[PDB]
RNA sequence: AGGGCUACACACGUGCUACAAUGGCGCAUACAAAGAGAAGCGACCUCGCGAGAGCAAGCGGACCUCAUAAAGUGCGUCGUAGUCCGGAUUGGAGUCUGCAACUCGACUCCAUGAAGUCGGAAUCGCUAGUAAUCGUGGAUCAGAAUGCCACGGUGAAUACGU
């Protein structure tokens, strides 16, 4: 279960908006190829410590229903066991047994 | 002197007055003040950021967002 | 193969500690846990004490090591030698 | 006709044949043939020695194996004398580019050793 | 050789002025340089003796006798006695040939060196120059691939102080210690 | 925040890809299916050595893209020598997602280059679109697929007998 994975999910959305919105194209503008003989200044790229938790790299989410770790599926907000459980009682729209 | 056994004298007895014209007569730093690594210490010499070829396009000073365009 | 791609790094974290340390010439080991971070001109003749996950290791910075990370000098893993396995119980 | 002897493979088509002079993989050999006035698909046995000369002068610019392998010896030694993780992994022979250790250790780490079970 | 008629003509007057000595002869010269190349071991094998001979040959062509210890009770390793050094003495015209190639081509050969402390001179101003390796002047079959075999370059002198010892190879510009 | 499962000494399990030539190499040459793409991909664009790249109209996917589908086809070439198969290692440069890419991340590419010549004990699925073998797409998915999941290419021996 753990409260830490639910606490994380809540913490990321104010901090996505707060750090990240100003920073969106800023990795490309100040650092990558778009900085050809323009920017390339350390003093404008030392600012990417602040978005560190708000990163595309920490949107691993896990379950919204239970907060349960490991084996996640974004398309349900669920995992293997917990999908099957909701599916058994017909709670997921469009979901049927597969035959072909 | 055991004369015969001695190898040739071609640049040995020759030009006991010679310059630094192609190679030094004494070296600096061979007495090791620092240990020699045979490496050049990068990012002290050379750049923290690479050559910028590929994707050379006039810069846009205003924010853009990959899911944010429709 | 791996690189550091295209941007310019000095680390934000190393900047405040270094700025006050360089003014003295040298001062007491700077408590760093940020071992992902690379070494730079600014840091030369200082002593960065490098968290390795268990404890800090003091790393002396000098011109030949600016091509490297703090984590490169500072260990992580243990290599188990291979003469013989431990066999037996102890009474 | 052998470019330099000791190992050139006799009567092979020309792109593959030059991968035993070293400094010359398939790509470098394709430009060398076109430059010298050689078709890719003749076998090497079809060439007179004065075609071998013309071909050979375009082989000769590239790095020789004796210098190649000294650079890579000194490259591994330079890191190994610093004690950075690059250098630490060279000492033992273990992977530096993220590769596994867990199995199939015989070609690098040698003969089987006792493991209690 | 070319060197010594020139050292007589140029350096002996330099030294004569520079120290304000009372005789032209009070000035130091180089006397025979014996070497060692104290290699050790190979008591039956003589292969490490053959590699030490091909390194000495570069600088002075004469045959190593390979000296052995006379009593065998010393603090060195004993096993069937021991062979150690070579000599391969530089003497007369061979010595005069040598002293111009030393500094000028022997230091440019050397890349890793721990010798030449200024305090260590004693006695006569006699010295032995620990160069850590073979100082290869041009030779046939020096190369057989080996390691270590730096040598004592054991200089001797008609110099009778430490500073008159240190006034050899001074018309060669080398950075010697104070 | 940093380190770690994927450690490493080996053994053991599994799958991939190989040990060949049914193939690899060079130059020329062909037709997919099915689906996925508001952390995402993306025409046009200019930059790039192929790949890629950054910019951006844009998308809802029978529209545009991933995607250059690969094995296979044509000619010449090669004979069990680790090669004309296999390409790991490793040095270097160009590119990427991110404070950060060294051990635990990705993509392209140049040079050289080891293990392995179908494996004693051990060891399983399979009755026909099956087994075999090749590529592709997808769920997950910052950046990692040999796995798993579905799809399409080419596609076998025999089932007497208990």
From Swiss-Prot, chain A:
GO BP annotations of the record are: cytoplasmic translation; ribosomal small subunit assembly; translation
Asked whether the keyword Ribonucleoprotein is assigned, the reply is: yes
Q: Which InterPro entries match?
A: Ribosomal_uS14, Ribosomal_uS14_bac/plastid, Ribosomal_uS14_CS
Question: SUPFAM superfamilies per the record?
Answer: Glucocorticoid receptor-like (DNA-binding domain)
Question: What Gene Ontology molecular function terms does this protein carry?
Answer: rRNA binding; structural constituent of ribosome; tRNA binding
Spell out the GO cellular component terms annotated for this protein, sorted alphabetically and separated by semicolons. Answer: cytoplasm; cytosolic small ribosomal subunit; small ribosomal subunit
What UniProt keywords apply to this chain's record, in alphabetical order? Answer: Ribonucleoprotein, Ribosomal protein
Family annotation (PROSITE patterns): RIBOSOMAL_S14
Superkingdom in the source lineage: Bacteria
> Do the record's keywords include Chaperone?
no
Chain's role = Binds 16S rRNA, required for the assembly of 30S particles and may also be responsible for determining the conformation of the 16S rRNA at the A site.
Q: Give the protein family.
A: Belongs to the universal ribosomal protein uS14 family.
Q: How does it assemble?
A: Part of the 30S ribosomal subunit. Contacts proteins S3 and S10.
The protein here is known as: Small ribosomal subunit protein uS14
Annotated source species: Escherichia coli (strain K12)
UniProtKB/Swiss-Prot annotation, chain C:
Ordered alphabetically, the record's keywords are: Ribonucleoprotein, Ribosomal protein, RNA-binding, rRNA-binding, tRNA-binding
| Cell membrane is among the record's keywords | no
User: What Pfam families does the record point to?
Assistant: Ribosomal_S19
Gene Ontology cellular component list: cytoplasm; cytosol; cytosolic small ribosomal subunit
Instruction: Look up the coiled coil feature and give its residue ranges.
Output: none
Q: Name one GO biological process term.
A: ribosomal small subunit assembly
Top-rank taxon of the source lineage equals: Bacteria
| Gene Ontology MF annotations | rRNA binding; structural constituent of ribosome; tRNA binding
PANTHER family named among the record's database cross-references: RIBOSOMAL PROTEIN S19P FAMILY MEMBER (PTHR11880), SMALL RIBOSOMAL SUBUNIT PROTEIN US19M (PTHR11880:SF8)
What does the annotation say about its assembly with partners?
A: Part of the 30S ribosomal subunit. Binds S13 and L5 and cross-links to the A site tRNA.
Indicate the family of this protein: Belongs to the universal ribosomal protein uS19 family.
Its annotated function is as follows:
In the E.coli 70S ribosome in the initiation state it has been modeled to contact the 23S rRNA of the 50S subunit forming part of bridge B1a; this bridge is broken in the model with bound EF-G. The 23S rRNA contact site in bridge B1a is modeled to differ in different ribosomal states, contacting alternately S13 or S19. In the 3.5 angstroms resolved ribosome structures the contacts between L5, S13 and S19 bridge B1b are different, confirming the dynamic nature of this interaction. Bridge B1a is not visible in the crystallized ribosomes due to 23S rRNA disorder.
Name assigned to this protein: Small ribosomal subunit protein uS19
Q: Which organism is it from?
A: Escherichia coli (strain K12)
Upper classification of the organism: Bacteria, Pseudomonadati, Pseudomonadota, Gammaproteobacteria, Enterobacterales
Instruction: Give the encoding gene's name.
Output: rpsS
UniProtKB/Swiss-Prot annotation, chain D:
Q: Which Gene3D superfamilies match?
A: 1.10.8.50, 30s ribosomal protein s13, domain 2 (4.10.910.10)
Write down any Gene Ontology CC term.
cytosolic small ribosomal subunit
Q: Which GO terms describe its molecular function?
A: rRNA binding; structural constituent of ribosome; tRNA binding
Per the UniProt entry, what is one GO biological process? Answer: cytoplasmic translation
User: Per the record's keyword annotation, is Cell membrane included, yes or no?
Assistant: no
UniProt entry tagged with the keyword Ribonucleoprotein: yes
The protein's UniProt keywords, in alphabetical order, are:
Ribonucleoprotein, Ribosomal protein, RNA-binding, rRNA-binding, tRNA-binding
According to the record, mutating residue 104 to H results in: In PW095; partially suppresses a rimM deletion
For region Disordered, the annotated ranges are 93-117
Subunit (UniProt): Part of the 30S ribosomal subunit. Forms a loose heterodimer with protein S19. Cross-links to the P site tRNA and weakly to the A site tRNA. Forms two bridges to the 50S subunit in the 70S ribosome, contacting the 16S rRNA and proteins S19 and L5.
List the PANTHER family: 30S RIBOSOMAL PROTEIN S13/40S RIBOSOMAL PROTEIN S18, SMALL RIBOSOMAL SUBUNIT PROTEIN US13M
State the family it belongs to: Belongs to the universal ribosomal protein uS13 family.
What is this protein's function? Located at the top of the head of the 30S subunit, it contacts several helices of the 16S rRNA.
What is this protein's name? Small ribosomal subunit protein uS13
Query: Its gene?
Result: rpsM
From Swiss-Prot, chain E:
UniProt record, GO biological process: cytoplasmic translation; ribosomal large subunit assembly; translation
> DNA-binding: is it a keyword of this entry?
no
Quaternary structure and interacting proteins, as annotated: Part of the 50S ribosomal subunit; part of the 5S rRNA/L5/L18/L25 subcomplex. Contacts the 5S rRNA; cross-links to the P site tRNA. Forms a bridge to the 30S subunit in the 70S ribosome, contacting protein S13 and S19.
User: Listed GO cellular component terms?
Assistant: cytoplasm; cytosol; cytosolic large ribosomal subunit
Q: Which InterPro entries match?
A: Ribosomal_uL5, Ribosomal_uL5_bac-type, Ribosomal_uL5_C, Ribosomal_uL5_CS, Ribosomal_uL5_dom_sf, Ribosomal_uL5_N
- Identify this protein by name: Large ribosomal subunit protein uL5
Q: Which Gene3D superfamilies match?
A: 3.30.1440.10
By its UniProt entry, which NCBIfam families does this protein fall under? Answer: PRK00010.1
**High-level lineage:** Bacteria, Pseudomonadati, Pseudomonadota, Gammaproteobacteria, Enterobacterales
**What's the source species for this entry?**
Escherichia coli (strain K12)
| HAMAP family xrefs | Ribosomal_uL5_B (MF_01333_B)
N6-acetyllysine PTM positions read 2
Which family, according to the similarity comment?
Belongs to the universal ribosomal protein uL5 family.
Q: Name one Pfam family in it.
A: Ribosomal_L5_C
Further details from the record: Identified as a multicopy suppressor of the slow growth phenotype of an rsgA (yjeQ) deletion mutant.
Name the keywords, alphabetized. Acetylation, Ribonucleoprotein, Ribosomal protein, RNA-binding, rRNA-binding, tRNA-binding
Which terms does the record give in the GO molecular function aspect?
5S rRNA binding; RNA binding; structural constituent of ribosome; tRNA binding
């Amino acid at each position: 279960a753990k409260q830490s994975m639910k606490a994380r999910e809540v913490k990321r959305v104010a901090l996505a908006d707060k750090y990240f919105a100003k920073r969106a194209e800023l990795k490309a503008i100040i650092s990558d190829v778009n900085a050809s003989d323009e920017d390339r200044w350390n003093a404008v790229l030392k600012l990417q410590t602040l978005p560190r938790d708000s990163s595309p790299s920490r949107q691993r989410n896990r379950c919204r229903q239970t907060g349960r770790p490991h084996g996640f599926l974004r398309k349900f907000g669920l995992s293997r066991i917990k999908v099957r459980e909701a599916a058994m009682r017909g709670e997921i729209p469009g979901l049927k047994k597969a035959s072909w | 002197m055991k004369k015969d056994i001695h190898p040739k004298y071609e640049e040995i007895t020759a030009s006991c007055s010679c310059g630094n014209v192609m190679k030094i007569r004494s070296t600096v730093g061979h007495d090791l003040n620092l240990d020699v690594c045979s490496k050049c210490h990068p990012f002290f010499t050379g750049k923290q950021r690479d050559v910028a070829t590929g994707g050379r396009v006039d810069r846009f000073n205003k924010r853009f967002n990959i899911p944010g365009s429709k | 193969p791996r690189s550091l791609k295209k941007g310019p790094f000095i680390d934000l974290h190393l900047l405040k500690k270094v700025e006050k340390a360089v003014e003295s010439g040298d001062k007491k080991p700077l408590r760093t846990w940020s071992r992902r971070s690379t070494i730079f001109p600014n840091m030369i003749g200082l002593t960065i004490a490098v968290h390795n996950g268990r404890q800090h290791v003091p790393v002396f910075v000098t011109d030949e090591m600016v091509g490297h990370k703090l984590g490169e000098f500072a260990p992580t893993r243990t290599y188990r030698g291979h003469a013989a396995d431990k066999k037996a119980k102890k009474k | 006709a052998r470019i330099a002897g000791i190992n050139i493979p006799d009567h092979k088509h020309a792109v593959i044949a030059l991968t035993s002079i070293y400094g010359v993989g398939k790509t470098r050999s394709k430009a060398i043939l076109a430059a010298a006035g050689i078709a890719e698909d003749v076998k090497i046995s079809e060439l007179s020695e004065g075609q071998i000369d013309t071909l050979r002068d375009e082989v000769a610019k590239f790095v020789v194996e004796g210098d190649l392998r000294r650079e890579i010896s000194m490259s591994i030694k330079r890191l190994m004398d610093l004690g950075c993780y690059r250098g630490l992994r060279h000492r033992r022979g273990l992977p530096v580019r993220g590769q596994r250790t867990k199995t199939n250790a015989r070609t690098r780490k040698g003969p089987r050793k006792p493991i209690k079970k | 050789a070319k060197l010594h008629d020139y050292y007589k003509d140029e350096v002996v007057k330099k030294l004569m002025t520079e120290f304000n000595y009372n005789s032209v002869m009070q000035v130091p010269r180089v006397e025979k340089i014996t070497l060692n190349m104290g290699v050790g071991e190979a008591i039956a094998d003589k292969k490490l003796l053959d590699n030490a001979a091909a390194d000495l040959a570069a600088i002075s062509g004469q045959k190593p006798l390979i000296t052995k210890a006379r009593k065998s009770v010393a603090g060195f390793k004993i096993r069937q006695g021991y062979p150690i050094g070579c000599k391969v003495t530089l003497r007369g015209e061979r010595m005069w040939e040598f002293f111009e190639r030393l500094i000028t081509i022997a230091v440019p050969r050397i890349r890793d060196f721990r010798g030449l402390s200024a305090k260590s001179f004693d006695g006569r101003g006699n010295y032995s120059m620990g160069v850590r390796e073979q100082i290869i002047f041009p030779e046939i079959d020096y190369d057989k691939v080996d390691r270590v075999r730096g040598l004592d370059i054991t200089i001797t002198t008609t110099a009778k102080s430490d500073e008159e010892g240190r006034a050899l190879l001074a018309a060669f510009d080398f950075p010697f210690r104070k």
